Design a protein around this nucleic acid. Structure first.
Ligand code: MG
Ligand code: MG
Ligand code: MG
Ligand code: MG
Ligand code: MG
Ligand code: MG
Ligand code: MG
Ligand code: MG
Ligand code: MG
Ligand code: MG
Ligand code: MG
Ligand code: MG
Ligand code: MG
Ligand code: MG
Ligand code: MG
Ligand code: MG
Ligand code: MG
Ligand code: MG
Ligand code: MG
Ligand code: MG
Ligand code: MG
Ligand code: MG
Ligand code: MG
Ligand code: MG
Ligand code: MG
Ligand code: MG
Lengths: 159, 175, 213, 168
RNA sequence: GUCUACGGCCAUACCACCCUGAACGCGCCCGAUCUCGUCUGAUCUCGGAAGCUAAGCAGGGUCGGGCCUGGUUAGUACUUGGAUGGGAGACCGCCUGGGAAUACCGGGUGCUGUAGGCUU
RNA sequence: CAUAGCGACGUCGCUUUUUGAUCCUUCGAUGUCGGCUCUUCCUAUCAUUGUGAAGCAGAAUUCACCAAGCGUUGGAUUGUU
RNA sequence: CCUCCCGUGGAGCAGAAGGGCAAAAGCUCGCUUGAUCUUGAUUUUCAGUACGAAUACAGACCGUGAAAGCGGGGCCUCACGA
RNA sequence: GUUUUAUCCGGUAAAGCGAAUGAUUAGAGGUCUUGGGGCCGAAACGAUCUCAACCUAUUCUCAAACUUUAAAUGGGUAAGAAGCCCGGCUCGCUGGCGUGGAGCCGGGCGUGGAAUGCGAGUGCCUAGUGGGCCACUUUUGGUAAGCAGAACUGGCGCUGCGGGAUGAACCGAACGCCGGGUUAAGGCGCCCGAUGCCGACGCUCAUCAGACCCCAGAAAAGGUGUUGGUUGAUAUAGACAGCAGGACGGUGGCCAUGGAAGUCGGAAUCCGCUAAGGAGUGUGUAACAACUCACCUGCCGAAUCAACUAGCCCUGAAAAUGGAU
């Protein structure tokens, strides 16, 4: 009995944040999107043209085509029991660069730097980041102070 | 929390050192638990109730059993506790006689279960204290403060009712 | 023609306020929420006693009206008509609905059974939580037993379990009674009518020097 | 106060059966190689493994094995996964042929690598077939509740060794 | 130490009132032949340089409002998973992890990019 | 004179002798109203036995308790219940 | 009717509601016909079929503006047919 | 069908309304007006008194179709050899630029760049099904339903076995034919395997006791039944309980009147005597009167009283064949 409208259920999704209405800041238009880079589809409602569908709000994809005002994004969509890589045309107002890719390329560059430097100076170094290891043994000093004795408080009705 | 014969554990914990306080304060509690694992769990429960600590953001630096320093001496234990009934929370003060502190706390748990149907997870023991005989308030305890205490064992019920199961003589209850 | 209150006791539905979608709501039974000497100053009535629910449930407007009337009558009998101030702390904002059926010997007569079952507004009830205050009475400190008895008599007009509580606050305010006198003394509180105005130590100095003058 | 190093080796025993299991718990139990009740597996402890153990907490009983528990487990129920088969560790050549490239060539090397979690703990642990232990002699307390509330599930710190003694 | 032109983030920048402003500058200011618009050279456009920092503007101030950021509220409300837990129920407690928001009390009040000036 | 006898505003229940709500059983069929006849069962007791209370002086009446042993009828009208 | 001041939009944008918008998307003027001619791709419903609606392009011919640009109907979500 | 480390997405739970949009309680302070008006203001309400409206600062209570703030759970992406870094070539695209972008061609880099687990990829043909139902949790309508409709996971259907006496779905556990050992859930008077332990501590007597998830029967409200607990009060300057006295004068206090004299009703709580006494807690007298109480005193010589609270038990507790832990 639900309608099939393109913007059904997007009352808060496409609405602007509190006290963030008005002119779209221009640095969003000044971003450079190459083919193959990773973008996050958000979809502000100020610009009604080139809007993504509500099923792509919050999804992340890879740019494959660049036009004057929009980009082509390959984004995975799950439909029933299959995931298919949809291709969507979204104006640049509704996307932004994904920081996870930036962090990963920074890590790759730093790892290559470490490899080159370590090969120059011979000493092996660890690159594969490890999960949080168990805490090692250590001494906890008292500094001549008795640890405070804690007792549960008696019950009383407050309000 | 189930039960058994409880033991007293001195559990000491603290927050993890963070670059806001490099030496967080150490805190100490007396936990009466069947074993040290339950003692650690109850310590975290209580210090989460009191301070803003969690098992994840803190550590336990000591968890050792507190041996009774006079298990050969009879003494009076006063216990302050709170528990949740079926329709509210109540603070109670109860008195018991035992050689050991943890024995008196176990007595308290059994007695709360017997009289108030209070399961052990509802009961919060907030102070256990040895009290002098002149500071006792419960008549059930004060009647044992007699240097010339004297009573018989009036009606001794046979307990060996199955050895023998059949016999000619009817048992005697006066001894 | 009202249904027994057991049929609308529990908070089973979402809140259903009288709004632009819910029209045709009959007016609530309770219209007056403050009785006694409402014009009494703050220092006149230091003692304040609440009656607190212990169950998450719905209290009907008629039940609030009946309890308010009973407490008013007992307070007038005991402390006099001007020795107290009562405040009903619940407002019937939730509308209950009735799917009315024909109470005759026939189902063929367009009864339709459960078809189109969404009802019409029966009345209004008040949703009360565990620990929420239902009624509050403030009076002289020497009428504590009379307040307790008046609130005890009002409990019999309500479905669930309620508790009587003598608050630590001064009157109907939110400040503790022990701190109230020495807060008024150093002008952190300014009385006005039945309440007090907390005066924080920030703002223009002109509003500070109109005080201490 | 001396706070000891946090344990880095855990023995995880699945205590509940395979009926009516939620998909996430089922997937994590498959990732722990615990596909049968009373199956045991050594788990190297870190944040990821601890969170995985948190996911399947009602279905497992785990703790910190001591040296004796590791010795008894490897010597009595130690089976190797050689050519995708379950082979009893009756000879040192069986260990040497499958793990000699990691320096593990005998029962003692395997036990040392498992106990002190070494560089090649993953290979030595995956080489071991998950331990198919018996029912706990003397019974359990309550498999449906946590250890700290009178039951058997969850993390009993070092009382897993008592369960191991009664288990194999 | 600042200003102008163009900006980025878009209140830590806004709002009300008060004080000060050296040199450039920005302005107010003078005028309507031309360009161009008017009911009106008020706005717009154009041509200027007598006067003034009164205003805009800049900086500072207010037990200032707002905003931003902390603490408290509070391991509270809420919540993942668990039990042959309690209770007639409504609901509640515990185990396992996560964890807020007012009121209330502190601190702060634009940062900066390019180009070009002034400041002994 | 609140409570001998009643009980507004509220509020908590019980029953399945009303009518509904639902559609689980029955559509290769469970004969569908009332009356007659006949037996047994329930008590939320009309009378009768033993009682307590009253605004029980007697008489009559009302409320309540133990209590279903026993009884609860003849007719006009109506297919009637 | 005229004038000044305050005025974050509390008005208006054809309509139901929601979103959006201030030297705007609203009001008033000036010029116009991009509501035109075409091929594909894509989104929405979806079986990833169709219709409908829509987004981003590309090729013509134009409109407007000093220009950057904007426009192939209506600020967006409906207004339709093998 | 997993976690971890990064990185985005959201508007539910909560919370808020001295923040917007709606709903809403009460006082307080101000001073304009077609507010009523207000007693002596007409005369310039000479005056200033009340209530309105309004404003300001507060205050009670709310929202599925409200919201500043805002979780838990959750959704997407990334965690390398298809990568990184060097040189060069092509373009009719772009263009101040040897510019940007894309493609292409050589070359060098392996610590294989989180944990855990698992062998994967791909094609053809294809039956049956397309009435479902149930349980935890969330949730809509309904008084409710073994009612109707959704979300999530599991189950029954398709499934036997141990337990719940009995039972499609509950709890344990899923199944080839067997022997030994051990358990789960559940149990161990007898039926009926196992407590024929010299089990531990208490609670409870019911002339309808109670007795184990689902589940197969109960509520509000009471109890001087008993057991704990909380708070408060009295007491050798003698409590408590019993038994015995005084319980006054003005004043048969005022306004009520037909008597109301303390007690059919309205207001206030005087004084002195002291051992105390209310110009009254009740009975009542047509009315007096006579009583009793709260208050003190005498005897009596050690502890006592009150209000709550919650455990078991009792009342509340009534249906039809004779009957069901
Ligand atoms: Mg009825
Ligand atoms: Mg509903
Ligand atoms: Mg199961
Ligand atoms: Mg045995
Ligand atoms: Mg279960
Ligand atoms: Mg300020
Ligand atoms: Mg929690
Ligand atoms: Mg059906
Ligand atoms: Mg037949
Ligand atoms: Mg027949
Ligand atoms: Mg009877
Ligand atoms: Mg074109
Ligand atoms: Mg358009
Ligand atoms: Mg809410
Ligand atoms: Mg509001
Ligand atoms: Mg169907
Ligand atoms: Mg259903
Ligand atoms: Mg079938
Ligand atoms: Mg199956
Ligand atoms: Mg089965
Ligand atoms: Mg069976
Ligand atoms: Mg049964
Ligand atoms: Mg066997
Ligand atoms: Mg049996
Ligand atoms: Mg036997
Ligand atoms: Mg009963």
């Amino acid at each position: 009995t639900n309608t099939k409208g393109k913007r059904r259920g997007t009352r808060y999704m496409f609405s602007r944040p509190f006290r963030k209405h008005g002119v779209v800041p221009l640095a969003t238009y000044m971003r450079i999107y190459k083919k193959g880079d990773i973008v996050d589809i958000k979809g502000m409602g100020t610009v009604q043209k080139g809007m993504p569908h509500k099923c792509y709000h919050g999804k992340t994809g890879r740019v494959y085509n660049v036009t004057q005002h929009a980009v082509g994004i390959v984004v995975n969509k799950q439909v029933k029991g299959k995931i298919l890589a949809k291709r969507i045309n979204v104006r640049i107002e509704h996307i932004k660069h994904s920081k996870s890719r930036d962090s990963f390329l920074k890590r790759v560059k730093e790892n290559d730097q470490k490899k080159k430097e370590a090969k120059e100076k011979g000493t092996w170094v660890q690159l594969k980041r490890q999960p949080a290891p168990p805490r090692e043994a250590h001494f906890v000093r008292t500094n001549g102070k008795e640890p405070e004795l804690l007792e549960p408080i008696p019950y009383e009705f407050m309000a | 929390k189930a039960s058994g014969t409880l033991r007293e554990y001195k559990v000491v914990g603290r927050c993890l050192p963070t670059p806001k306080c490099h030496t967080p304060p150490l805190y100490r509690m007396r936990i009466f638990a069947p074993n040290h694992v339950v003692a650690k769990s109850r310590f975290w429960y209580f210090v989460s109730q009191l301070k803003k600590m969690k098992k994840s953001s803190g550590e336990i630096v000591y968890c050792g059993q507190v041996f009774e320093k006079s298990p050969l001496r009879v003494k009076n234990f006063g216990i302050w506790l709170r528990y949740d009934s079926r329709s509210g929370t109540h603070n109670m003060y109860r008195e018991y006689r035992d050689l050991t502190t943890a024995g008196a706390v176990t007595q308290c748990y059994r007695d709360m279960g017997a009289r108030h149907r209070a399961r052990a997870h509802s009961i919060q023991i907030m102070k256990v204290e040895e009290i002098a005989a002149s500071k006792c308030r419960r008549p059930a305890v004060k009647q044992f403060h007699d240097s010339k205490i004297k009573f018989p064992l009036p009606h001794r019920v046979l307990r060996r009712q199955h050895k023998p199961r059949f016999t000619t003589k009817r048992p005697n209850t006066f001894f | 023609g009202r249904r027994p209150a057991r049929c609308y006791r529990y908070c089973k539905n979402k809140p259903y306020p009288k709004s632009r979608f819910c029209r045709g709501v009959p007016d609530a039974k309770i219209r007056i929420f403050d009785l006694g000497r409402k014009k009494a100053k703050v220092d006149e009535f230091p003692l304040g006693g609440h009656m607190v629910s212990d169950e998450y449930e719905q209290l009907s407007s008629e039940a609030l009206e009946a309890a308010r009337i009973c407490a008013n009558k007992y307070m007038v009998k005991s402390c006099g008509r001007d020795g107290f101030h009562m405040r009903v702390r619940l407002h019937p904002f939730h509308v209950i609905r009735i799917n009315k059926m024909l109470s005759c010997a026939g189902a063929d007569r367009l009864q339709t059974g459960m078809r189109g079952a969404f009802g019409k507004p029966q009345g209004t009830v008040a949703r009360v939580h565990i620990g929420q205050v239902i009624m509050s009475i403030r009076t002289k400190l020497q009428n504590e037993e009379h307040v307790i008895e008046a609130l005890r008599r009002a409990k019999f007009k309500f479905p669930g379990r309620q508790k009587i509580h003598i608050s630590k606050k001064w009157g109907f305010t939110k400040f503790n009674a022990d701190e109230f006198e020495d807060m008024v003394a150093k002008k952190c509180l300014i009385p006005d009518g039945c309440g007090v105005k907390y005066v924080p130590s920030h703002g223009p100095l002109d509003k500070w020097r109109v005080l201490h003058s | 106060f001396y706070v000891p190093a946090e344990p880095k080796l855990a023995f995880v025993i699945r205590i509940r059966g395979i009926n009516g299991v939620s998909p996430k718990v089922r997937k994590v139990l498959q990732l722990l190689r615990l596909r049968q009740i009373f199956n045991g597996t050594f788990v190297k402890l870190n944040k990821a493994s601890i969170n995985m153990l948190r996911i399947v907490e009602p279905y497992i009983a785990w703790g910190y094995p001591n040296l004796k528990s590791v010795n008894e487990l490897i010597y009595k129920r130690g089976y190797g996964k050689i050519n995708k088969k379950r082979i009893a560790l009756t000879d040192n050549a069986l260990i040497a042929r499958s793990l000699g490239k990691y320096g593990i060539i005998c029962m003692e090397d395997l036990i040392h690598e498992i106990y002190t979690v070494g560089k090649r703990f993953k290979e030595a642990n995956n080489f071991l077939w998950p331990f198919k232990l018996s029912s706990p002699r003397g019974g359990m307390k309550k498999k449906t509740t946590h250890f700290v509330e009178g039951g058997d599930a969850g993390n009993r710190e070092d009382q897993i060794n008592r369960l191991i003694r009664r288990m194999n």
